[PDB]
Design a protein around this nucleic acid. Structure first.
Ligand SMILES: [Cl-]
Ligand SMILES: [Cl-]
Ligand code: NA
Ligand code: NA
Lengths: 319, 319
DNA sequence: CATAATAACAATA
DNA sequence: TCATGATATTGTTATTATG
DNA sequence: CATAATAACAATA
DNA sequence: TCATGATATTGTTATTATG
């Protein structure tokens, strides 16, 4: 328990923002910096409570998810400046009802999607487009194609993925590769953090591996590699978004706009349709190929979004 | 907040047990009765804590699930004698780690089953046997057949089920009926408590309805109707168990012994295989036909236990 | 000289 | 299963009384 | 006289 | 997503500087 410290990343972001040619003012980051600064020398939890109450009063008007995210930012700043043992971490948090309601809403959305799956009629054209993106010389395109083919998250694909040949007996597997660099694990001991596991691919493994080699050895590929989530977001998010919008504009199901992470969802589906052994559930297979926490099947629920046109067809054959 | 009261059901069970021709002594019920008796006049929470600590010390040696169940019994007794506002309800409970570990174990079991589904090779013979049980004159048999065909829980089937014709446009549906009397709802406002909803049946609806009419109008049927869970358990559980063991001894998959609730599991599976529309997930369909809480998909995980031989076959066709 | 009856004991949803 | 701090079911076995 | 750049704002897993 | 009290990602839009 120290009473002194500074949140380096926020301050650096501000000082970096002092040379902005355009864009918003970093007001939130400013408030966080001022918060941490005012925290220095504080010992009375009453004062801490008052401060955090001021901050809470400021965030009034924002959306629930937004407020939650901001709270996450504040807490990470506190951890960065003062450590995990600071008492403010017992004060600077959301009220229980907030997280309860967030959970309720999320589960409601998932439950709604499960009762109204979207028919991905042109999924073959999408997969085709990704496979075409594999051969492009534009690193972004190759990345998108890799999101489509390996089903790895954008951050994983662009910043930290490790793809390698998967041994099939005494040879190399054609329809699967080894992957390392799972994201969002939070370094849980039951997670795939630092674990190399085998995943299926929706095209020949040679093409995937080669394409990833072309991506890594690229200039933008060497710029991307090792990036923090903020760096990657600020650098690529909107461009990737626009490019994805434009690529699949006319083939994506009209119930929704084509977003990058959708390619992950679809992947799972297609993968399950083609490679899943008969002794496993859809939840279990999703959980396996997506690299989820040990013994978890609940996260998989979030990925059941589409239904394949053939499944739709023969589910109408049986009737 | 009163300090006086008696748990009527326990005492009545004891006084009823005073005329036992055979069987164990009601020691647990005795301890609960003595507990409630000693609670009378208690005002100091320290004393309450000491008492419940004595009880906890007694239960040492039992299994975790057992201790949990016993705690449930104690709490229900406290609620019966003193009401929901008694402070002992804040003391007479399990420590958080116990329920955490229970959850962990349960989820681990489910996750294990999801990665090793059992091939129900002879499920057609089982369904056939149930359909045969529908025409029997033995009410128990009819009940079993109804567990197999309607997929309703034993307690529901024998004690409180309300089956009725399901309207299909301007007529009666052949492959579905209306059901009322959902169990285990705990009267949640998002549950099917007191709700009549439509369920699929694995044989013609006429046969089901007729068979249930023959069951209800029976003597044992009129004895069963309206029974508490304890009454039904003590009256029927072991007989139903033995009969179920004997009926499906040679056709049930050899990975497990044939238990009544299995017929529910299987039901779901078969139902999903035959009736599920293409726009819904297996989780959602299970949740729908099993009558689960609103927006819940997690309970359905517990019912994915078997895999049908045809699915096994064509999952090996695709390979 | 042995079996059925009962509730403890236990696991599942 | 409903809620996420537990309860309500379903499943198994030791112990007891009894010509 | 208008567009791109940036971080706020927001939702998903 | 990992844990079940939240965090780490991915997705959207208002605001700002700038010949
Ligand atoms: Cl293909
Ligand atoms: Cl059939
Ligand atoms: Na919301
Ligand atoms: Na256990």
């Amino acid at each position: 328990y120290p009473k002194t410290g500074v949140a380096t990343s926020i301050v650096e972001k501000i000082e970096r923002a002092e040379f902005n040619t355009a864009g918003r003012k970093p007001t939130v980051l400013l408030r966080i910096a001022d918060f941490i600064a005012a925290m220095n020398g504080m010992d009375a939890k009453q004062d801490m409570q008052a401060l955090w109450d001021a901050e809470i009063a400021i965030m009034n008007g924002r959306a629930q998810t937004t407020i939650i995210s901001y709270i996450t930012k504040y807490r990470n700043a506190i951890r960065e400046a003062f450590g995990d043992d600071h008492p403010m971490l017992k004060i600077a948090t959301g009220d229980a009802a907030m997280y309860d309601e967030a959970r309720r809403v999320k589960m409601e959305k998932i439950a709604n999607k499960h009762g109204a799956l979207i028919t991905f009629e042109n999924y073959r054209q999408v997969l085709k487009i990704c496979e075409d993106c594999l051969k492009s010389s534009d690193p972004l395109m190759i990345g998108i194609g890799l999101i489509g083919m390996t089903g790895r998250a954008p951050y994983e694909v662009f910043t930290q993925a490790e793809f390698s040949p998967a041994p099939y007996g005494k040879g190399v597997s054609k329809w699967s590769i080894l992957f390392n660099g799972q994201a969002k694990t939070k370094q849980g001991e039951g997670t795939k953090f630092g674990i190399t596991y085998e995943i299926p691919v929706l095209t020949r493994s040679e093409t995937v591996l080669a394409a990833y080699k072309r991506l890594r050895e690229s200039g933008q590929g060497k710029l991307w590699h090792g990036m923090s989530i903020d760096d990657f977001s600020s650098e690529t998010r909107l461009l990737l978004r626009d490019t994805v919008f434009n690529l699949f504009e006319d083939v994506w199901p009209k119930e929704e706009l084509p977003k990058p992470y959708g390619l992950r969802h679809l992947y799972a589906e297609v993968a399950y349709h083609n490679f899943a052994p008969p002794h496993v559930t859809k939840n279990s297979y999703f959980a396996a190929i997506l690299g989820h926490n040990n013994n978890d099947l609940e996260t998989s629920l979030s990925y059941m979004t589409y239904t394949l046109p053939e499944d739709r067809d023969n589910a109408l054959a049986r009737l």
